[PDB]
Amino acid sequence: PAYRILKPWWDVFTDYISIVMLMIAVFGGTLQVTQDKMICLPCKWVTKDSCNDSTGPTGIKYDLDRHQYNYVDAVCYENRLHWFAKYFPYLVLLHTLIFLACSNFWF
Amino acid sequence: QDKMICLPCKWVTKDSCNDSTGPTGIKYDLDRHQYNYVDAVCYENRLHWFAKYFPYLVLLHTLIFLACSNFWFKFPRTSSKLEHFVSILLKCFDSPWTTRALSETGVLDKKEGEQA
Amino acid sequence: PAYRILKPWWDVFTDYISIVMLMIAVFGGTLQVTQDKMICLPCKWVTKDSCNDSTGPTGIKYDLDRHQYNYVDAVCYENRLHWFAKYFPYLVLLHTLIFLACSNFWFKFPRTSSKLEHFVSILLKCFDSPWTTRALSET
Amino acid sequence: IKFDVDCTVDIESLTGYRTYRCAHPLATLFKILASFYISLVIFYGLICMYTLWWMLRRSLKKYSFESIREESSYSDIPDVKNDFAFMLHLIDQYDP
Amino acid sequence: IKFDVDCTVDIESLTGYRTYRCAHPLATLFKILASFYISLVIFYGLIC
Amino acid sequence: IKFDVDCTVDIESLTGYRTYRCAHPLATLFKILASFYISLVIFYGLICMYTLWWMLRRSLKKYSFESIREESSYSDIPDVKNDFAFMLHLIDQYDP
Amino acid sequence: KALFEKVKKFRTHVEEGDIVYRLYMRQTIIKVIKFALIICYTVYYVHNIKFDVDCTVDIESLTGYRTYRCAHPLATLFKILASFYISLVIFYGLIC
Amino acid sequence: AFRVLKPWWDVFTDYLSVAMLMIGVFGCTLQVMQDKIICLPKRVEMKGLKTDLDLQQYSFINQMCYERALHWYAKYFPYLVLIHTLVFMLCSNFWFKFPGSSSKIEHFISILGKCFDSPWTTRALSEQAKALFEKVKKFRLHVEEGDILYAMYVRQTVLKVIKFLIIIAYNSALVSKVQFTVDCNVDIQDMTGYKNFSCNHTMAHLFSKLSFCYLCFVSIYGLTCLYTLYWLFYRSLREYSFEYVRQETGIDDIPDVKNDFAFMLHMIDQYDPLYSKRFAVFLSEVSENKLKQLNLNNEW
Amino acid sequence: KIICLPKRVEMKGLKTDLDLQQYSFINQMCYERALHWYAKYFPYLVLIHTLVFMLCSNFWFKFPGSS
Amino acid sequence: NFSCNHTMAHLFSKLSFCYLCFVSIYGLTCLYTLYWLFYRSLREYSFEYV
């Protein structure tokens, strides 16, 4: 309303920076909700519990069902994905929310 | 819906597709999930980031163009002068004395004279 | 807009009927867009271009891959399905839109619209006249 | 609109078969939608024909304008002409 | 921007293949968008 | 946040395999998002440090108020105390 | 009296300009010519919407095949949409 | 106009209607997106149980059994909820959407607001409203000859109670029909070689609990409507005697009101007794005489 | 969604010769059976409690007699 | 026998933990309000300053 004059230039700039941060965080969150997956493929030569990585070329046949592919993808995504990699947008959204709450604290 | 469909080349000559009784489907002995993985990796590495992030660069450039367009309206110091100027100019454009002064290049109310 | 008093009860009833018709047309159109398909099965025992259809059970294998199923489904849907059944929601949308246009054209026709706004504005202020109340009080 | 159809689309060089029976899952849903819509169209036609007859019944081109002139005793409220008796009749329909 | 892009991503421990050709359907669309966008950019530059 | 990950969840009674190489397509995209967001954070922090440093340097609990009264010879313009000088300084920042 | 003065001033100020007429004339001519273009070229190309298409895309090293036949589901729908659109364009040209 | 015509039970019914509409939309969306029936042949170290059937056969069996086996009520249940909630909303809005009575309602709202807005009412209970008195009396000449508004509202309440009764009556019987599992035997043998099929759709139990909540809401709505209808046929809203303005302010005027006016005053008293008291000032002949005397002493 | 596989049985594939529809049926049944009810109803539970909180917080001023 | 899993589990767990902390703060606010209600005896207001 008439509270425009109260905000210094840096206050408006913080407002818009927070706006941009919240926008990108929401976009990242809604993208992670639907399109975030991981594609997993096993390794046949396993040395020290690791991938040993050992006439046209022929395809390598792991003889695994697509449902097994889905199960292993989900399990690997859960166990061995960095938690920050899994919750960056939600953390950014929380930080924007607390920034807004601090800004309108006195308001 | 952005993605790539990748198929390997059987004849590789210096890392290049050599391209060397009815027709039959060439089988690469690869399941669907392998196609998904290879498509993902190839799209990740060999696709130019410019073609991948074109809309994002366009959006960023539009945003900065709009911000530069409205910044003076948004900056308090300039905006104060702008609102002062536009507020004064509108009434200067609509003054009851402006019309009569332009006509003369009479009887006037004291209120309109005081306001002028 | 004060044109609401210009609408009799049947005008409002036609408006509501057209609103419901538009809603059902949109619903049908979007559902047909998202999910209207056909699932086709070839017939191996054919009599007069008609499916004769004449130790546990075993499934029938028609030696067809998935893409062939998709292709034949699209072909029969395009060819051997009635156009009215496929295009029912869009015909409904056309009918609703033209009903709305016939409803609003006189309102949207400037020649009539000028007279309508003039009449309604005059009648409202006549009903608002401080002398009408006195005159009808004395009657 | 039927749930199941039969197509002799005659594609043998590509498929190799004569006839195919296809199930359209949404035929029942489209049937229900069509029934509801045709009932709504019946209602709309009822309303439109009622209004058409009512307009063709009272001859709204001239407003008799006698009730108030007889009640409030203002004989100088003569009949209004066409395109005005229309307005007066419509206002009477809303609120006289 | 090309509809087809060729990659040697060097995965043989899992695939055994060296080179691959890929079709990217939206590339031509992206080129059309780029042309229409740079048209507007040129117009904005002229006005400025 | 890396595009390629290597996980050994040790499920062999269901698969038989031990180690898996996996791809996270958005990891480059999430890296871009992280860099952009932290650049925004740097800008926000620079702005906030500017604000706090300006506030500490200003000492705006008493409004000097002497330049205006000295210029206009309005000697009755006393310096106002805290909760009035701070707001006065903020409004001066908006508009002197 | 003030309205008289303002009307005379506006008449002298506006009778001399002669730009709005030029702008609307140009807009009318542009609408006519653009309608002519989009009724000519669209109708010339309208037959190119076909349900079945034969493509010999010349890919054997990855497929082993030469020629292919395809069904495009939306050809009928797009043809109908184009017909309705060009009818509306004809109406637009009549108005122009 | 749009606010003071709603007693507390009316707002409660509005909230119940909104909840039912949202629930119906949620069920319809769930049916559109995810509602699918999965079917397998029933009659048959433990290993796989392949039946050499393809994906097209899978989909066709799902289609045929869903069309045949699943209850039509079960399929239309989100649609049925949506339809009944839409009817409830339509009949809720139609009381004001019919112009013939809506004109009287709008005039009543406007005149009550203007009369209560006049501070001379407070002066008497302790300017131009004198002329506004004419409208008041004109209003008492016009709407007291109505009462068809009361009949319309009673019709609406009866229809709403009937809808709730029918919904409870047949939904209670149909609720137990839905099941997570189901079986179907169709002549898909010699088309696929199998006739018996065990099937299930994911939604079943979730929709069952959804129906439980919906029926609880319908019960609450029925209770509210029952309270309203009972109050309609217990206080005899066809006549309203104030017996308080006459006793408190000592004015023997304001004899009575007609059926429509009594019903309106009852509804306003349900919303707030004090607005009716402030509106009754201009129906008071003693007050109107006092205002005329004050105007006459001013003008003389 | 719940992904299900059978538990009891150079490494190779471990196919159980089942199709996708069988996978889906098993997923449905185990989702109904094995998954905790409160786990499945947590979103509805939170929504219902929040609705009750909002309704009882507004009911002070939505109560016309005292409002 | 069938081993199964649904993806949203741990994410739901974290979200639920955050929600429970929120409800904890909500209850703390409620307790502060009730204490202020059960300590000042709001049945009578005495100005004693006007």
Side-chain angles (χ1 to χ4, degrees):
Chain A
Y3 311 155
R4 51 182 188 279
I5 71 181
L6 280 310
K7 320 166 187 294
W9 52 277
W10 59 60
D11 193 7
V12 189
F13 297 163
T14 49
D15 173 31
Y16 280 153
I17 291 182
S18 41
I19 281 293
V20 176
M21 290 163 55
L22 179 67
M23 186 183 312
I24 63 175
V26 170
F27 152 76
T30 189
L31 171 67
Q32 174 183 338
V33 152
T34 41
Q35 294 82 2
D36 180 22
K37 299 158 287 82
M38 294 189 61
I39 319 186
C40 287
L41 290 180
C43 286
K44 311 189 70 56
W45 293 285
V46 163
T47 56
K48 309 174 304 177
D49 313 341
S50 67
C51 296
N52 193 29
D53 297 330
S54 177
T55 77
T58 64
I60 299 186
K61 333 194 177 190
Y62 295 88
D63 328 315
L64 288 168
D65 313 333
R66 179 178 158 268
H67 231 68
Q68 297 161 356
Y69 282 118
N70 308 332
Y71 199 102
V72 70
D73 292 15
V75 170
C76 175
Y77 160 85
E78 185 61 46
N79 302 16
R80 264 63 197 89
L81 187 52
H82 200 252
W83 50 272
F84 155 78
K86 303 192 303 179
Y87 306 114
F88 155 88
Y90 316 99
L91 285 176
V92 176
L93 149 73
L94 155 72
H95 304 346
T96 54
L97 289 182
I98 182 184
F99 264 117
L100 296 189
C102 293
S103 295
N104 276 336
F105 189 24
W106 57 344
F107 284 142
Chain B
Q1 291 150 147
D2 175 48
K3 56 216 173 192
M4 309 182 69
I5 314 176
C6 293
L7 295 178
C9 281
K10 294 214 56 56
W11 294 274
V12 173
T13 41
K14 298 181 299 183
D15 290 335
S16 69
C17 302
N18 189 24
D19 316 321
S20 181
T21 58
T24 49
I26 293 185
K27 316 120 181 175
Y28 288 100
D29 325 334
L30 294 163
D31 43 285
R32 180 147 154 259
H33 195 91
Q34 289 180 310
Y35 302 120
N36 309 337
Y37 196 96
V38 71
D39 278 310
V41 175
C42 172
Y43 179 97
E44 175 70 30
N45 305 295
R46 262 64 200 172
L47 186 53
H48 197 320
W49 46 266
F50 159 85
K52 306 194 295 184
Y53 312 138
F54 156 87
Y56 309 138
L57 298 188
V58 171
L59 168 84
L60 148 72
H61 300 343
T62 59
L63 291 182
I64 173 177
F65 260 144
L66 281 195
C68 293
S69 307
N70 308 19
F71 166 74
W72 58 330
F73 288 2
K74 302 313 171 182
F75 193 79
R77 188 171 327 192
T78 55
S79 182
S80 47
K81 297 199 172 205
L82 296 189
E83 55 88 8
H84 202 175
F85 183 77
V86 69
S87 58
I88 294 196
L89 177 78
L90 260 299
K91 79 235 315 171
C92 293
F93 181 78
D94 300 320
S95 135
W97 195 76
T98 37
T99 148
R100 190 182 166 277
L102 267 295
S103 179
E104 312 282 7
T105 280
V107 43
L108 281 312
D109 181 12
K110 188 168 183 175
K111 286 186 175 182
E112 59 91 63
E114 289 279 343
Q115 291 147 13
Chain C
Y3 307 95
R4 70 174 212 276
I5 70 178
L6 277 308
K7 299 174 172 295
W9 49 272
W10 65 78
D11 276 12
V12 190
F13 296 166
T14 44
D15 284 0
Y16 272 13
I17 291 181
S18 294
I19 289 297
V20 181
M21 285 160 52
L22 182 68
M23 175 179 295
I24 64 178
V26 171
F27 166 79
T30 186
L31 205 46
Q32 199 240 29
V33 163
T34 184
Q35 289 167 44
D36 166 54
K37 319 156 306 304
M38 307 205 71
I39 295 305
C40 299
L41 308 173
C43 290
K44 295 176 62 63
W45 297 268
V46 186
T47 47
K48 319 157 307 174
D49 280 1
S50 70
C51 301
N52 190 16
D53 317 321
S54 174
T55 56
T58 57
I60 302 185
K61 320 180 190 185
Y62 292 99
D63 314 359
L64 295 169
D65 42 64
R66 202 56 202 148
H67 209 70
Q68 283 180 110
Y69 300 121
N70 317 330
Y71 195 100
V72 71
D73 294 5
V75 164
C76 178
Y77 161 79
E78 165 95 3
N79 295 265
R80 269 59 185 168
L81 185 51
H82 190 47
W83 46 272
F84 140 86
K86 304 179 299 182
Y87 309 139
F88 153 84
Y90 320 110
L91 297 168
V92 172
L93 164 73
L94 183 82
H95 300 343
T96 59
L97 286 178
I98 186 178
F99 271 140
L100 296 177
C102 293
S103 312
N104 301 16
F105 169 59
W106 58 328
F107 284 128
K108 307 295 178 178
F109 195 52
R111 189 173 209 164
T112 58
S113 170
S114 52
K115 317 193 184 195
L116 299 190
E117 57 92 9
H118 198 193
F119 164 69
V120 62
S121 60
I122 288 184
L123 182 47
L124 213 287
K125 62 195 293 182
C126 286
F127 177 80
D128 201 85
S129 166
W131 197 84
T132 41
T133 153
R134 198 205 183 279
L136 273 311
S137 171
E138 312 308 321
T139 319
Chain D
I1 302 186
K2 309 148 306 176
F3 185 84
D4 30 326
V5 203
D6 274 3
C7 12
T8 317
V9 286
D10 191 8
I11 21 183
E12 309 189 52
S13 54
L14 289 181
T15 83
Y17 295 84
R18 281 316 303 152
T19 56
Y20 323 82
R21 180 158 193 84
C22 311
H24 175 230
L26 312 191
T28 292
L29 164 119
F30 263 57
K31 206 161 308 180
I32 300 300
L33 303 185
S35 59
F36 205 89
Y37 179 64
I38 62 181
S39 57
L40 296 187
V41 174
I42 292 175
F43 273 144
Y44 201 97
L46 291 173
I47 298 181
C48 281
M49 294 203 65
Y50 156 79
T51 301
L52 173 60
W53 152 82
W54 152 88
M55 170 179 45
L56 209 62
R57 176 259 292 179
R58 199 189 157 177
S59 178
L60 304 189
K61 276 201 168 300
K62 189 186 60 54
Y63 208 75
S64 314
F65 232 158
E66 81 305 335
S67 143
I68 173 155
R69 86 181 169 200
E70 189 179 358
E71 161 68 22
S72 305
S73 180
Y74 291 88
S75 178
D76 337 356
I77 314 183
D79 304 21
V80 295
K81 281 298 302 171
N82 41 12
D83 193 20
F84 213 179
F86 194 60
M87 304 175 175
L88 299 204
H89 285 109
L90 295 184
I91 293 300
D92 202 312
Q93 290 288 160
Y94 167 73
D95 201 353
Chain E
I1 296 177
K2 288 130 304 185
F3 167 77
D4 51 320
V5 176
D6 304 344
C7 36
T8 304
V9 283
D10 191 10
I11 31 179
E12 293 213 315
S13 59
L14 310 187
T15 81
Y17 288 87
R18 289 298 303 178
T19 68
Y20 323 78
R21 179 162 220 101
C22 319
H24 167 217
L26 316 182
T28 299
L29 264 181
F30 268 54
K31 185 170 300 180
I32 296 294
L33 297 191
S35 61
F36 188 83
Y37 165 67
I38 62 186
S39 71
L40 310 174
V41 181
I42 287 186
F43 276 116
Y44 206 102
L46 294 183
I47 299 179
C48 279
Chain F
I1 302 189
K2 293 149 294 185
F3 164 73
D4 32 0
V5 192
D6 288 327
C7 45
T8 306
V9 286
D10 191 8
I11 35 181
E12 323 210 61
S13 56
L14 321 177
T15 75
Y17 283 100
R18 273 277 307 200
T19 73
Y20 323 93
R21 188 132 179 82
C22 311
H24 170 204
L26 329 175
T28 303
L29 223 174
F30 280 172
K31 170 192 299 176
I32 298 298
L33 299 188
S35 71
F36 185 64
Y37 154 73
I38 63 180
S39 64
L40 299 167
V41 169
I42 295 174
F43 278 47
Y44 206 112
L46 290 177
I47 292 182
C48 286
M49 287 197 59
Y50 190 104
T51 295
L52 183 58
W53 158 87
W54 159 90
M55 177 162 43
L56 245 50
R57 181 263 260 181
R58 181 58 195 185
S59 176
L60 57 171
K61 288 180 174 295
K62 197 206 59 53
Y63 197 83
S64 298
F65 233 169
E66 78 285 67
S67 185
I68 158 73
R69 61 180 164 185
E70 177 188 8
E71 184 64 39
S72 296
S73 183
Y74 279 60
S75 180
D76 322 1
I77 303 187
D79 302 13
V80 213
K81 296 297 303 135
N82 40 32
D83 225 11
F84 248 69
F86 163 71
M87 306 176 183
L88 235 172
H89 291 93
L90 279 183
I91 304 300
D92 162 71
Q93 297 295 305
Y94 178 88
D95 203 21
Chain G
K1 174 191 174 183
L3 193 59
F4 254 104
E5 296 196 32
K6 294 172 184 177
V7 164
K8 299 185 184 175
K9 285 290 187 174
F10 182 82
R11 179 188 186 196
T12 305
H13 160 65
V14 165
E15 281 186 339
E16 203 179 25
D18 204 328
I19 174 63
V20 193
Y21 175 86
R22 297 200 302 261
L23 263 179
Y24 197 86
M25 169 71 68
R26 291 168 178 175
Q27 294 169 210
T28 314
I29 301 172
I30 290 169
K31 292 161 191 180
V32 175
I33 60 102
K34 178 172 49 180
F35 138 78
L37 301 166
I38 66 184
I39 219 275
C40 181
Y41 94 93
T42 308
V43 176
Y44 175 75
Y45 273 157
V46 74
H47 58 251
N48 300 125
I49 295 183
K50 288 158 288 186
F51 173 68
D52 43 343
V53 167
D54 315 343
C55 41
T56 308
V57 272
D58 190 14
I59 36 185
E60 302 202 72
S61 63
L62 309 187
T63 75
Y65 293 89
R66 279 297 314 207
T67 87
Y68 318 86
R69 186 169 193 89
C70 318
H72 171 219
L74 309 195
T76 294
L77 232 184
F78 279 22
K79 175 172 295 179
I80 298 303
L81 295 190
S83 171
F84 181 61
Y85 162 74
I86 63 186
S87 63
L88 292 190
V89 169
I90 291 177
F91 274 162
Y92 206 117
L94 301 183
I95 299 171
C96 290
Chain H
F2 337 99
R3 166 183 63 261
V4 296
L5 293 319
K6 308 183 179 179
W8 55 270
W9 61 77
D10 193 73
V11 179
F12 287 160
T13 49
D14 175 76
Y15 288 170
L16 296 171
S17 315
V18 169
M20 275 172 51
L21 183 74
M22 174 195 58
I23 280 175
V25 169
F26 192 67
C28 290
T29 283
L30 289 186
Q31 180 182 1
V32 166
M33 278 297 295
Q34 311 299 336
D35 176 48
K36 301 169 303 301
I37 284 194
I38 276 73
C39 286
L40 303 154
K42 182 267 163 188
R43 181 117 56 254
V44 183
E45 185 178 350
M46 59 308 177
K47 300 165 188 169
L49 202 54
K50 67 190 67 175
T51 59
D52 44 290
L53 289 158
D54 57 65
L55 200 56
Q56 184 82 179
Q57 291 166 318
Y58 294 159
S59 50
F60 200 95
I61 296 170
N62 298 319
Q63 279 179 331
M64 283 299 299
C65 183
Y66 171 93
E67 165 259 335
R68 292 274 73 174
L70 192 54
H71 192 183
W72 52 280
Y73 137 82
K75 291 172 287 184
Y76 315 154
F77 163 68
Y79 308 122
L80 194 277
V81 167
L82 185 270
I83 286 180
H84 272 259
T85 320
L86 281 190
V87 174
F88 266 143
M89 278 299 303
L90 176 59
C91 66
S92 172
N93 297 131
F94 173 74
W95 195 26
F96 311 137
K97 288 315 172 182
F98 175 68
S101 56
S102 182
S103 51
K104 320 299 168 301
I105 296 175
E106 175 267 349
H107 194 183
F108 185 69
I109 291 305
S110 63
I111 190 55
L112 212 165
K114 292 159 64 182
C115 172
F116 140 84
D117 195 60
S118 180
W120 188 90
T121 59
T122 309
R123 184 178 311 175
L125 294 185
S126 302
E127 182 198 349
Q128 304 291 345
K130 154 243 185 179
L132 198 268
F133 267 112
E134 309 271 311
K135 180 172 292 300
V136 177
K137 73 197 60 181
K138 188 222 294 99
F139 197 89
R140 89 102 51 88
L141 294 179
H142 195 83
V143 182
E144 297 179 359
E145 307 178 15
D147 120 291
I148 35 82
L149 184 73
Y150 158 84
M152 189 73 64
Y153 182 73
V154 165
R155 287 171 177 254
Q156 295 158 7
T157 55
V158 169
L159 290 171
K160 294 179 184 181
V161 178
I162 287 177
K163 276 194 56 191
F164 137 80
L165 286 171
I166 302 176
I167 280 291
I168 281 296
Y170 71 76
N171 287 261
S172 303
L174 297 178
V175 147
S176 56
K177 189 73 173 183
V178 301
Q179 307 292 321
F180 193 86
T181 56
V182 72
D183 196 305
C184 42
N185 286 38
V186 202
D187 190 22
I188 332 190
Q189 188 176 32
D190 315 333
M191 309 302 300
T192 58
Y194 303 80
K195 170 194 171 190
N196 200 334
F197 302 95
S198 310
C199 309
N200 77 139
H201 80 111
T202 73
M203 324 304 300
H205 251 45
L206 160 122
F207 270 168
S208 305
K209 300 307 178 183
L210 196 277
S211 321
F212 200 103
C213 301
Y214 172 81
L215 287 182
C216 293
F217 302 148
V218 171
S219 309
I220 303 173
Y221 192 89
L223 295 172
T224 302
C225 286
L226 282 181
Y227 194 91
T228 307
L229 207 51
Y230 247 169
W231 167 67
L232 287 183
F233 285 83
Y234 187 85
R235 208 65 274 171
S236 184
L237 311 188
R238 287 186 165 183
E239 274 211 22
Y240 187 102
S241 295
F242 284 81
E243 298 290 320
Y244 199 43
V245 205
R246 179 192 51 78
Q247 287 182 349
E248 171 61 38
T249 45
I251 52 185
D252 298 331
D253 45 25
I254 318 182
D256 257 349
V257 279
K258 216 60 78 284
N259 294 343
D260 201 339
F261 245 68
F263 176 77
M264 285 177 174
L265 218 284
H266 278 287
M267 283 299 185
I268 297 305
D269 170 79
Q270 296 302 285
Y271 180 87
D272 173 71
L274 196 271
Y275 292 173
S276 62
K277 189 73 54 51
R278 293 203 148 274
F279 183 67
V281 186
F282 285 177
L283 216 279
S284 170
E285 211 56 53
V286 177
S287 73
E288 188 172 354
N289 299 326
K290 293 188 185 302
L291 185 41
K292 269 194 302 296
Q293 185 63 220
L294 167 65
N295 197 283
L296 185 135
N297 293 130
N298 291 16
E299 206 248 16
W300 261 86
Chain I
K1 292 175 293 299
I2 292 193
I3 308 178
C4 280
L5 305 175
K7 183 266 157 190
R8 176 80 87 261
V9 160
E10 179 193 355
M11 31 293 183
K12 309 169 186 181
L14 203 59
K15 52 201 62 181
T16 58
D17 62 287
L18 296 173
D19 59 69
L20 184 57
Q21 170 143 226
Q22 292 157 330
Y23 304 154
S24 340
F25 189 99
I26 297 174
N27 292 304
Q28 289 176 84
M29 278 303 307
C30 185
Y31 166 88
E32 181 268 306
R33 299 266 64 183
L35 202 56
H36 189 206
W37 58 276
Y38 135 87
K40 300 180 290 185
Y41 313 149
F42 164 79
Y44 323 123
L45 184 279
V46 175
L47 188 271
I48 289 173
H49 278 257
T50 315
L51 261 186
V52 173
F53 266 155
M54 288 300 302
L55 177 57
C56 71
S57 187
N58 287 120
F59 165 79
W60 202 16
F61 308 144
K62 308 311 173 185
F63 187 95
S66 65
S67 184
Chain J
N1 196 335
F2 291 93
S3 301
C4 309
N5 67 109
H6 90 97
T7 64
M8 343 287 298
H10 236 69
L11 160 131
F12 279 168
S13 297
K14 302 280 186 177
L15 182 269
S16 313
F17 179 81
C18 296
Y19 164 79
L20 292 190
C21 293
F22 301 158
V23 175
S24 306
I25 304 183
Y26 187 84
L28 290 183
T29 292
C30 292
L31 285 189
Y32 198 87
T33 299
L34 199 58
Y35 272 177
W36 171 75
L37 284 173
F38 270 88
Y39 188 80
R40 205 69 279 155
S41 186
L42 306 187
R43 316 198 144 186
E44 292 169 6
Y45 178 86
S46 305
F47 288 78
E48 316 313 310
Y49 176 83
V50 181

